[PDB]
Design a protein around this ligand. Structure first.
Ligand SMILES: N#Cc1ccc(-c2ccc(OCC(=O)O)cc2CN2CCN(c3ccccn3)CC2)cc1
Ligand SMILES: N#Cc1ccc(-c2ccc(OCC(=O)O)cc2CN2CCN(c3ccccn3)CC2)cc1
Lengths: 306, 306
């Protein structure tokens, strides 16, 4: 006996679930352009059933807010509306957290109950490169210490406080660094999805995940993720690395053969270690685990028993 | 702003409650049954509203369980009832956790939604004294390493998994040790309260607090708790120390001045620093912080915004 219900892909299909609520095919157009390669059978069969499920919990939280407010007899100090409902998404680099997030943000916003869904990445809570160097941390971008954990805690606290706005820094993926003076403003949305490698990580402190209301871990075999990371690296020669402005411009010129070697090395020495030591252990802390096959389709869902 | 709504004693009392919540006959009589001078006015005016508030959360989760199972068209692999709803109670030694937990267990059981409330203390997961000496830990009883954290985790997991039964060892407070062979057997209660020093503690592992649905931290000025620790020691000359079988019998004969010195020293060297290092830092992880006045009465409630 486990604290999770487990459904393989066959079983999850083989239900028997409530709504049509099916997708408008004007919305399926908007859904294609959240690149990389968005499978639409994935959305219909997995992410929409998932979104409905999460809506159940967001709705339950909303009613419970109201029932409690009513029991307390709407006192001054009680807030007027439920505080944002925060979802965490965790997983290895290159597992597709970002895609998973953008898809859930688009689906969950379809309900009248909670139409304002914000998405923030913890990438903005990285120390700037300058500070990273200063701490011997350039080879460890994405490990726990490479984030300003205090600032990140302040951000989420403030959001969960129900404050009017909350500012986050913005990480530029092209420049591989924080953007000086850039800020993402967050104004008490109904849901906030928080995406990052570190969002389910433990701490002697209070940690951000104490402020979640739901969390996903996006899981895959480690071999499989390596393969995605390599294919991604080679593809970046055309785009990120192509700009002569990039610090990683010199990778643009590597042949396929040599780029594979370079990818696999960066994998082995930064991300794979980060995954095993720090990311994988936070997996059993997620409300829902999604295991993806080698070709990106979800082959197993684990869901905490309610 | 803050993620807690805050009421003090007056505000909480003076509130327009949406029910005539009065305790019955019969209710007060059975509550005198725990009545190590339990203040029944506090029980009616503070604990009962609090119990009602926790009830709302239990009933919301119970219905979510139902909405969710209905949505998945109740699959064979889905459980047939909500798993137990688990409540942590933490705080300093001699802060009154155990009283607070027993009172809550009595008040929560009165709803038909969940008449079966169990109570377990993490005291039962301490290593036996013989294992403690073996580890140079006799002087750190109640520090985190003094518990079999693995067995404790297995216990809470098993209950949150929905097992028919789960066992926990049993601690004799008068003999200061585990009772060999004793077991407390928990059988899918509707609600399980888990009381202890360490219940809200962090670990790199999946920790027990990951399995709670709600948690209490019982708070007080550190000075006050010392005063109560000292008084309780003096009072113990008459109860626990009075037995000449006891390992601490010799304390029964110490007079007020010496007993104060002895008590104050034990506090300064074991309990106080356990509180500062390991217990105080978990306080912000709780859903509800109850803070008691020098005279044991609750004077502030901080509740997490919904
Ligand atoms: N020293 C050193 C030193 C030198 C070079 C690199 C390096 C070069 C090219 C890369 O292109 C492939 C890609 O970008 O996938 C990737 C990396 C390493 N990654 C940087 C982004 N990191 C994170 C992690 C979390 C959030 C944002 N960013 C995770 C690790 C790394 C370290
Ligand atoms: N070495 C040593 C060594 C020797 C003696 C004592 C000792 C003697 C008499 C005491 O009587 C006063 C009282 O009982 O309040 C209290 C203690 C210390 N406390 C024992 C209970 N401990 C815990 C903690 C969690 C759960 C249960 N128990 C917390 C620390 C302590 C350490």
């Amino acid at each position: 006996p486990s604290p999770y219900v487990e459904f393989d892909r066959r079983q999850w299909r083989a239900l028997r679930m409530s709504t049509p609520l099916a997708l408008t095919e004007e919305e399926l157009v908007g859904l294609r352009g959240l690149g990389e390669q968005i499978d639409l059978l994935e959305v219909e069969e997995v992410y929409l059933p998932l979104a409905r499920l999460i809506h159940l919990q967001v709705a339950a939280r909303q009613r419970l807010f109201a029932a409690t407010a009513e029991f307390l007899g709407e006192p001054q100090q009680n807030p007027d509306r439920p505080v944002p409902f925060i979802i965490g998404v965790a997983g290895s680099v290159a597992v597709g957290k970002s895609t998973t997030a953008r898809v859930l943000q688009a689906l969950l916003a379809r309900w009248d109950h909670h139409p304002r869904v914000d998405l923030v990445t913890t990438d903005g809570f990285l120390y700037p490169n300058a500070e990273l160097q200063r701490r011997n941390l350039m080879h460890r971008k994405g490990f726990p210490e490479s984030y300003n954990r205090r600032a990140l805690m302040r951000f989420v606290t403030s959001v969960k406080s129900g404050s009017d706005y909350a500012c986050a820094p913005v990480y530029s993926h092209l420049h591989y660094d924080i953007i000086p003076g850039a800020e993402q403003v967050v104004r008490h949305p109904d849901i906030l999805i928080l995406e990052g490698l570190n969002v389910l990580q433990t701490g002697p402190t209070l940690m951000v995940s104490d402020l979640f209301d739901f969390s996903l871990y996006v899981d895959a075999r480690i071999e499989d993720i390596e393969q995605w990371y390599v294919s991604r690296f080679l593809a970046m020669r055309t785009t990120a690395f192509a700009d002569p402005e990039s610090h990683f411009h010199h990778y643009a010129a590597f042949s396929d053969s040599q780029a594979v070697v370079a990818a696999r090395e960066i994998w082995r020495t930064i991300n794979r270690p980060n995954l095993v030591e720090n990311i994988l252990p936070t997996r059993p802390r997620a409300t829902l685990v999604l295991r993806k096959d080698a070709d990106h389709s979800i082959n197993r869902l684990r869901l905490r028993k309610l």
